[PDB]
Design an enzyme around this catalytic site. Structure first.
Site, PDB file in Angstrom:
ATOM      1  N   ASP A  34       0.711  -1.210  -0.082  1.00 38.74           N
ATOM      2  CA  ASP A  34       0.204  -0.055   0.048  1.00 38.74           C
ATOM      3  C   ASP A  34       0.765   1.278   0.054  1.00 38.74           C
ATOM      4  O   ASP A  34       1.411   1.638   1.028  1.00 38.74           O
ATOM      5  CB  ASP A  34      -1.025   0.110   1.313  1.00 38.74           C
ATOM      6  CG  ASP A  34      -2.148   1.096   1.202  1.00 38.74           C
ATOM      7  OD1 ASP A  34      -2.191   1.737   0.512  1.00 38.74           O
ATOM      8  OD2 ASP A  34      -2.733   1.053   2.263  1.00 38.74           O
ATOM      9  N   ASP A 216      -1.657   5.721  -5.626  1.00 40.18           N
ATOM     10  CA  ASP A 216      -2.081   4.578  -4.575  1.00 40.18           C
ATOM     11  C   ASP A 216      -2.297   3.166  -4.839  1.00 40.18           C
ATOM     12  O   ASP A 216      -3.596   2.891  -5.615  1.00 40.18           O
ATOM     13  CB  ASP A 216      -3.239   5.172  -3.639  1.00 40.18           C
ATOM     14  CG  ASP A 216      -3.892   4.334  -2.525  1.00 40.18           C
ATOM     15  OD1 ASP A 216      -3.225   3.619  -2.132  1.00 40.18           O
ATOM     16  OD2 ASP A 216      -4.682   4.903  -2.052  1.00 40.18           O
TER      17      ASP A 216
HETATM   18  C1  LIG Z   1      -6.505  -2.366  -3.731  1.00 40.25           C
HETATM   19  O1  LIG Z   1      -7.860  -2.881  -3.103  1.00 40.25           O
HETATM   20  C2  LIG Z   1      -7.480  -3.576  -1.907  1.00 40.25           C
HETATM   21  C3  LIG Z   1      -7.204  -3.002  -0.682  1.00 40.25           C
HETATM   22  C4  LIG Z   1      -7.242  -2.438   0.389  1.00 40.25           C
HETATM   23  C5  LIG Z   1      -7.409  -1.855   1.699  1.00 40.25           C
HETATM   24  C6  LIG Z   1      -7.934  -2.322   2.981  1.00 40.25           C
HETATM   25  C7  LIG Z   1      -8.314  -1.543   4.049  1.00 40.25           C
HETATM   26  C8  LIG Z   1      -7.551  -0.454   4.149  1.00 40.25           C
HETATM   27  C9  LIG Z   1      -6.828   0.087   3.023  1.00 40.25           C
HETATM   28  C10 LIG Z   1      -6.335   1.673   3.067  1.00 40.25           C
HETATM   29  C11 LIG Z   1      -6.018   1.903   4.319  1.00 40.25           C
HETATM   30  C12 LIG Z   1      -4.810   1.450   4.900  1.00 40.25           C
HETATM   31  C13 LIG Z   1      -4.364   1.782   6.003  1.00 40.25           C
HETATM   32  C14 LIG Z   1      -5.327   2.632   6.893  1.00 40.25           C
HETATM   33  O2  LIG Z   1      -4.820   2.854   7.993  1.00 40.25           O
HETATM   34  C15 LIG Z   1      -3.342   3.092   8.638  1.00 40.25           C
HETATM   35  F1  LIG Z   1      -3.466   4.078   9.627  1.00 40.25           F
HETATM   36  F2  LIG Z   1      -2.893   1.957   8.927  1.00 40.25           F
HETATM   37  C16 LIG Z   1      -6.429   3.289   6.523  1.00 40.25           C
HETATM   38  C17 LIG Z   1      -6.610   2.838   5.102  1.00 40.25           C
HETATM   39  N1  LIG Z   1      -5.136   1.709   2.165  1.00 40.25           N
HETATM   40  C18 LIG Z   1      -5.614   2.918   1.175  1.00 40.25           C
HETATM   41  N2  LIG Z   1      -4.695   3.063   0.348  1.00 40.25           N
HETATM   42  N3  LIG Z   1      -6.929   3.290   1.412  1.00 40.25           N
HETATM   43  C19 LIG Z   1      -7.465   4.004   0.702  1.00 40.25           C
HETATM   44  C20 LIG Z   1      -8.813   4.661   1.425  1.00 40.25           C
HETATM   45  F3  LIG Z   1      -8.237   5.467   2.269  1.00 40.25           F
HETATM   46  F4  LIG Z   1      -9.517   5.197   0.364  1.00 40.25           F
HETATM   47  C21 LIG Z   1      -9.492   3.351   2.054  1.00 40.25           C
HETATM   48  N4  LIG Z   1      -8.738   2.515   2.724  1.00 40.25           N
HETATM   49  C22 LIG Z   1      -7.444   2.456   2.216  1.00 40.25           C
HETATM   50  C23 LIG Z   1      -6.877  -0.571   1.837  1.00 40.25           C
END
Ligand SMILES: COCC#Cc1cccc([C@@]2(c3ccc(OC(F)F)cc3)N=C(N)N3CC(F)(F)CN=C32)c1
Length: 370
Positions: A34, A216
């Site tokens: 990610d 992303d």
């Molecule tokens: C490519 O699709 C597969 C996937 C996935 C996924 C699952 C959970 C969280 C995330 C997270 C995510 C990851 C970590 C997070 O918190 C961190 F503090 F750990 C929050 C969101 N990763 C991304 N890039 N985003 C984009 C968003 F914000 F629109 C919505 N959520 C996320 C991605």
């Protein structure tokens, strides 16, 4: 970097993952790659969607930081405990580092059913790390503790490869074009021009970056701001006017199906995104084919047909160049030189008529940022 080739598994819909080991003795887990987050957050408690989880009690190297972490976001929720432990990537650099780990105890709409991953490798900068910027991300710890160069690259194939500390020339064709990382938080970039079938959207370039534009790997779709999304849908609708689809398809809420092997790829236009170059008013373009923005949805029940979901959606948080845009391109995250490189991947998408491309230079004789 032969040993790192083919180290990723998965798809755009459920995400690309790398095998990683946590603790001592090492515990194997599949971890989401990610570039849109900054925490190394792993499932540390049983969950209906987890096949395995991080067991802190079985690790003699685990150190509790006595600090909780609660992450409420738009698409979901997750909470846990902060700690540090030994981390390694079996099909990555031959190194072992002590990194921060967010042990996920409770979650809501975070983990995905049948995704095959149990954690997330947040590859973006400390500014967006949770609970705050003091929690050092994994890549920063890796670079600080080893002689691994401050660079990583992603070759996502519609499987794939993550090359840590370098560029593998066997993963791309032609030249690498660089766009500057505007700010070190998310992998923020600048879009200067958008074309649909060579036709300019004719908007002030700031509109394409309202309020930011990011690269992303943790997002499936190409997400565009409301105004840009509407004009893009209008241009794609006009170009593919021979066939009419339900409004639901354009909103990403319903599937479009055609008899197996009869997808009319030629009725759909190509999308060109012009990224800011390293030099003043100069740019390069990345060309996206329908094979990238019409994401197939694998379902045995609908298998007499090939069904697709429109992988372009509306955003209120700026442009997101998701997994569907990254597929068929070799993306170099040159942290040391504050730039993102793009080149045509060896696993690029193409038919007998059109090919995905990285081309330049282009001259536009204003600042496109917010
Ligand atoms: C490519 O699709 C597969 C996937 C996935 C996924 C699952 C959970 C969280 C995330 C997270 C995510 C990851 C970590 C997070 O918190 C961190 F503090 F750990 C929050 C969101 N990763 C991304 N890039 N985003 C984009 C968003 F914000 F629109 C919505 N959520 C996320 C991605």
């Amino acid at each position: 970097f032969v040993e790192m080739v083919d180290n990723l598994r998965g798809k755009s819909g459920q995400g690309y993952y790398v095998e990683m080991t946590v603790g001592s003795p090492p515990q194997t887990l599949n971890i989401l790659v990610d570039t849109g987050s900054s925490n190394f957050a792993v499932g540390a408690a049983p969950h209906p969607f987890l096949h395995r989880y991080y067991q802190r009690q079985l690790s003699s190297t685990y150190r509790d930081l006595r600090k909780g972490v609660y992450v409420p976001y738009t698409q979901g929720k997750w909470e846990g405990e902060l700690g540090t432990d030994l981390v390694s990537i079996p099909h990555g650099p031959n190194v072992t580092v002590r990194a921060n780990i967010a042990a996920i105890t409770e979650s809501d709409k975070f983990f995905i059913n049948g995704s095959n991953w149990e954690g997330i490798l947040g590859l973006a900068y400390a500014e967006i790390a949770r609970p705050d910027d003091s929690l050092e991300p994994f890549f920063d710890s890796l670079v600080k503790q080893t002689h691994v160069p401050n660079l990583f690259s992603l070759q996502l194939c519609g499987g794939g490869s993550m090359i840590i500390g370098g560029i593998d020339h066997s993963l791309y064709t032609g030249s690498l074009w660089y766009t500057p990382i505007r700010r070190e938080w998310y992998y923020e970039v600048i879009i200067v021009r958008v074309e649909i079938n060579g036709q300019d959207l004719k908007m002030d370039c700031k509109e394409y970056n309202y309020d930011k534009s990011i690269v992303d790997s943790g997002t499936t779709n190409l997400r565009l701001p409301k105004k840009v999304f509407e004009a893009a849908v209008k241009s794609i609708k006009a170009a593919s006017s021979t066939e009419k689809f339900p409004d639901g398809f354009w909103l990403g809420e319903q599937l479009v199906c055609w008899q197996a092997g009869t997808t009319p790829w030629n009725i759909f236009p190509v999308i060109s995104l012009y990224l800011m170059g390293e030099v003043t008013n100069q740019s390069f373009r990345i060309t996206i084919l329908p094979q990238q923005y019409l994401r197939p949805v694998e379902d045995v029940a609908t298998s007499q047909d090939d069904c697709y979901k429109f992988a372009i959606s509306q955003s209120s948080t700026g442009t997101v160049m998701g997994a569907v845009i990254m597929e068929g391109f070799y993306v170099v995250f040159d942290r040391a030189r504050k730039r993102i490189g793009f080149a045509v991947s060896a696993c690029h998408v193409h038919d007998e008529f059109r090919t995905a491309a990285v081309e330049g230079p282009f001259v536009t004789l204003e600042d496109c940022g917010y």
